[PDB]
Amino acid sequence: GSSRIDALEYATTRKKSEVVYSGVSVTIPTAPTNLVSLLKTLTPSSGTLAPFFDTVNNKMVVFNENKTLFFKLSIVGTWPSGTANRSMQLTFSGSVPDTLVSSRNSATTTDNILLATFFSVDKDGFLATNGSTLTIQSNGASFTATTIKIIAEQ
Amino acid sequence: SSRIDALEYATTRKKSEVVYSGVSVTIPTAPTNLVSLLKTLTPSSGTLAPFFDTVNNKMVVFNENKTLFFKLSIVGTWPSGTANRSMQLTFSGSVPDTLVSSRNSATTTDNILLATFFSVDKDGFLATNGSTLTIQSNGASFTATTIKIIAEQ
Amino acid sequence: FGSSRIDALEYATTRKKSEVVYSGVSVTIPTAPTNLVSLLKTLTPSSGTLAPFFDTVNNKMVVFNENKTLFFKLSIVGTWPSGTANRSMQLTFSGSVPDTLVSSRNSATTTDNILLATFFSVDKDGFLATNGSTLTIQSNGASFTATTIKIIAEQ
Ligand SMILES: N[C@@H](CCC(=O)O)C(=O)O
Ligand SMILES: N[C@@H](CCC(=O)O)C(=O)O
Ligand SMILES: N[C@@H](CCC(=O)O)C(=O)O
């Protein structure tokens, strides 16, 4: 059972890109923006875009395995003073595209954002074959981010 | 090795991943049983079984201490001109869970992504009873044109 | 062969959790920042236990020192006062970078029930493993009165 134990150890070992950008000043505009293209201009405070964020094709990529990928994006920042209705959205291309939206209104005063989801990657499936283009967009006004934490794990 | 066989089972994902393409599905402002709604459609890929029970119109789970991950991705629209709007999805359970994706005038897109998990216990409420999923559009009716639903455990 | 490695794999694939249900309660979530563990710990659970993931001495969520992700869910049945239009529930987790969850709604939505779910990619010997997380909850728009609460952390 030696080889099968090796395989199980691999199967139960988390693979991850956990990248933190601290003390930055990054504009997330109201026009759609490729998130990998935006981030790769910055120097991480810790972590690396590789292996989950491909800086050649500007996409999230996955391991070709029947193992689900968990994704989280935590953004510290602000919209302009007085911005009432506002949201942050993030779309992932795929066989069916997924659009995350975090909306708020005047009742909420914090502007910090937390988006989380998962992708049920199939071997030789769409994500494994093509990757995913991540398109971020701020709604209501432009957003200025000062800390960004992005995680993809599988 | 029985223990290695078991570990391979334990670490193998079980899933329903069902896609409905090119449809025009009304999600009304009144509560609607989601499994009942979907089973009137023909998947472009995947199968409702084993996680979506079309006899009792509910989500069902394996009787295992293994968490179920759920995602509903909808490409669709609220009517042109709709400002305040939301999509909600309730799961029955010992304590019912109500997911809400709300938005307002600031957001143009009407596409929806609801993701959550259920910490299934052996012999617990979900394993025993399953969960009725009740979907409802708020602010106006909604029309779904692509639906992707995933339950995995 | 490989007995210890198999033991370790069985441990790695065994979910550890706190799942606490508070049924038939009346809990005010005010408009000011409020420590969530402090708020819950005086309530007698209907089922489950706050320990080990919710530490009632330091009022923090705490984690096992393992390279294993923690999944978190908070399900709340309750209400804002009648007529409350714009409203949200906010939950912040301290961390190297704090995470701020918001569930907002407006006049279009009648239900006041709330579901917040997320995960934390715990690293062995990392920030959460060493410090835990202070969970701070706040109701926006008006005070919220919770009557059923289900809280889960698993790793
Ligand atoms: N199974 C799809 C992903 C489904 C999802 O969006 O989670 C793929 O491998 O591309
Ligand atoms: N432990 C509950 C589910 C808890 C949850 O909603 O995640 C059950 O087995 O029914
Ligand atoms: N890796 C971080 C947690 C990252 C997260 O917020 O998920 C820690 O161990 O504290």
Side-chain angles (χ1 to χ4, degrees), chain A residues 16 18 72 149 151, chain C residues 99 119-123 126-128:
Chain A
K16 177 169 66 168
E18 172 167 323
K72 188 169 65 164
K149 170 176 62 178
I151 294 163
Chain C
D99 288 1
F119 71 90
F120 298 90
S121 191
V122 176
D123 296 321
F127 181 99
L128 288 172

Side-chain angles (χ1 to χ4, degrees), chain C residues 87-126:
Chain C
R87 60 211 195 276
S88 74
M89 190 64 69
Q90 174 182 331
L91 179 61
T92 305
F93 291 80
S94 64
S96 297
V97 176
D99 288 1
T100 306
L101 306 186
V102 177
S103 181
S104 183
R105 58 196 70 172
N106 55 49
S107 62
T109 303
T110 301
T111 186
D112 287 345
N113 298 330
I114 298 157
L115 194 293
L116 299 170
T118 193
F119 71 90
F120 298 90
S121 191
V122 176
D123 296 321
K124 188 166 185 167
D125 302 324

Side-chain angles (χ1 to χ4, degrees), chain B residues 9-147:
Chain B
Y9 177 77
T11 56
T12 294
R13 186 179 60 204
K14 299 184 289 298
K15 173 170 71 169
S16 289
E17 173 165 324
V18 197
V19 177
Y20 301 92
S21 299
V23 296
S24 191
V25 182
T26 307
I27 302 175
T29 60
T32 304
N33 183 305
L34 180 60
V35 175
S36 293
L37 183 63
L38 296 179
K39 72 185 196 179
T40 69
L41 312 173
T42 305
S44 62
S45 64
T47 62
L48 289 173
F51 289 92
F52 301 101
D53 175 351
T54 55
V55 171
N56 302 292
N57 303 313
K58 54 183 39 178
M59 187 177 72
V60 292
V61 309
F62 290 85
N63 191 22
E64 302 174 5
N65 287 316
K66 191 181 186 189
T67 290
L68 183 151
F69 291 90
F70 177 93
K71 188 168 67 165
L72 178 60
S73 179
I74 302 170
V75 175
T77 315
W78 284 278
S80 179
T82 307
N84 285 1
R85 58 214 196 276
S86 78
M87 190 64 71
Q88 75 184 59
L89 180 60
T90 301
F91 292 79
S92 67
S94 294
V95 178
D97 288 1
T98 301
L99 304 185
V100 176
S101 183
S102 182
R103 57 195 73 172
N104 56 47
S105 60
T107 303
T108 294
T109 185
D110 288 346
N111 299 326
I112 298 159
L113 197 291
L114 300 176
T116 193
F117 69 92
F118 299 90
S119 191
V120 175
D121 294 321
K122 211 130 114 62
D123 307 320
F125 183 104
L126 288 173
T128 302
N129 302 118
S131 180
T132 295
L133 279 59
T134 303
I135 194 163
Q136 180 177 292
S137 180
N138 299 308
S141 68
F142 184 96
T143 300
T145 55
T146 313
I147 300 166

Side-chain angles (χ1 to χ4, degrees), chain C residues 14-154:
Chain C
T14 295
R15 184 184 64 202
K16 298 181 289 299
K17 74 168 181 186
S18 292
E19 172 167 326
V20 197
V21 173
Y22 301 95
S23 293
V25 296
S26 188
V27 178
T28 303
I29 305 175
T31 58
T34 302
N35 183 303
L36 180 58
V37 176
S38 295
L39 185 64
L40 298 177
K41 73 182 183 177
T42 45
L43 301 170
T44 130
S46 303
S47 68
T49 64
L50 284 170
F53 289 91
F54 302 102
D55 181 330
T56 59
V57 170
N58 65 7
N59 306 312
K60 293 169 185 168
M61 187 178 72
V62 295
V63 311
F64 289 81
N65 193 27
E66 301 170 13
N67 291 310
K68 189 181 185 190
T69 292
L70 181 154
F71 292 89
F72 175 93
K73 188 169 69 167
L74 179 61
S75 181
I76 311 170
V77 174
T79 61
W80 286 279
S82 183
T84 310
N86 286 358
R87 60 211 195 276
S88 74
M89 190 64 69
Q90 174 182 331
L91 179 61
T92 305
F93 291 80
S94 64
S96 297
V97 176
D99 288 1
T100 306
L101 306 186
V102 177
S103 181
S104 183
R105 58 196 70 172
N106 55 49
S107 62
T109 303
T110 301
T111 186
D112 287 345
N113 298 330
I114 298 157
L115 194 293
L116 299 170
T118 193
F119 71 90
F120 298 90
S121 191
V122 176
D123 296 321
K124 188 166 185 167
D125 302 324
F127 181 99
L128 288 172
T130 304
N131 293 104
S133 183
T134 294
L135 280 55
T136 303
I137 194 164
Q138 174 182 307
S139 176
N140 300 307
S143 296
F144 186 95
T145 305
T147 53
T148 301
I149 301 168
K150 170 175 63 178
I151 190 172
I152 294 165
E154 64 187 48

Side-chain angles (χ1 to χ4, degrees), chain A residues 98 118-122 125-127, chain B residues 15 17 71 148 150:
Chain A
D98 289 2
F118 69 90
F119 298 90
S120 191
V121 174
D122 295 322
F126 184 102
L127 290 169
Chain B
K15 173 170 71 169
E17 173 165 324
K71 188 168 67 165
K148 172 176 61 177
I150 294 163

Side-chain angles (χ1 to χ4, degrees), chain A:
Chain A
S2 180
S3 298
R4 290 167 67 208
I5 296 170
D6 292 346
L8 283 160
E9 290 178 347
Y10 177 87
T12 57
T13 296
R14 188 178 61 205
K15 298 183 290 299
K16 177 169 66 168
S17 289
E18 172 167 323
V19 197
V20 175
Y21 303 91
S22 293
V24 296
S25 187
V26 177
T27 302
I28 304 172
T30 57
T33 303
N34 182 306
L35 180 59
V36 175
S37 294
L38 184 60
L39 295 179
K40 74 181 191 178
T41 66
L42 314 172
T43 304
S45 304
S46 62
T48 61
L49 289 173
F52 289 92
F53 301 103
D54 172 349
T55 60
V56 175
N57 299 304
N58 302 313
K59 54 190 22 166
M60 186 179 74
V61 293
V62 308
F63 289 84
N64 190 24
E65 301 168 11
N66 284 333
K67 188 181 190 188
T68 291
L69 182 153
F70 291 89
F71 177 93
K72 188 169 65 164
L73 180 60
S74 181
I75 313 172
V76 177
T78 64
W79 283 278
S81 298
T83 308
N85 289 356
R86 59 210 196 277
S87 74
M88 189 68 69
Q89 71 185 63
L90 180 61
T91 300
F92 292 78
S93 66
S95 294
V96 179
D98 289 2
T99 299
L100 309 185
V101 178
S102 181
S103 182
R104 59 196 67 173
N105 54 50
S106 61
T108 304
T109 62
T110 187
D111 287 346
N112 298 333
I113 299 154
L114 195 291
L115 300 176
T117 193
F118 69 90
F119 298 90
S120 191
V121 174
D122 295 322
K123 199 178 206 55
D124 296 332
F126 184 102
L127 290 169
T129 300
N130 302 112
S132 181
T133 295
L134 278 57
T135 302
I136 194 163
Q137 181 175 291
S138 178
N139 299 306
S142 66
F143 185 97
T144 304
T146 55
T147 297
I148 300 169
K149 170 176 62 178
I150 188 170
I151 294 163
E153 67 186 44
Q154 195 190 185

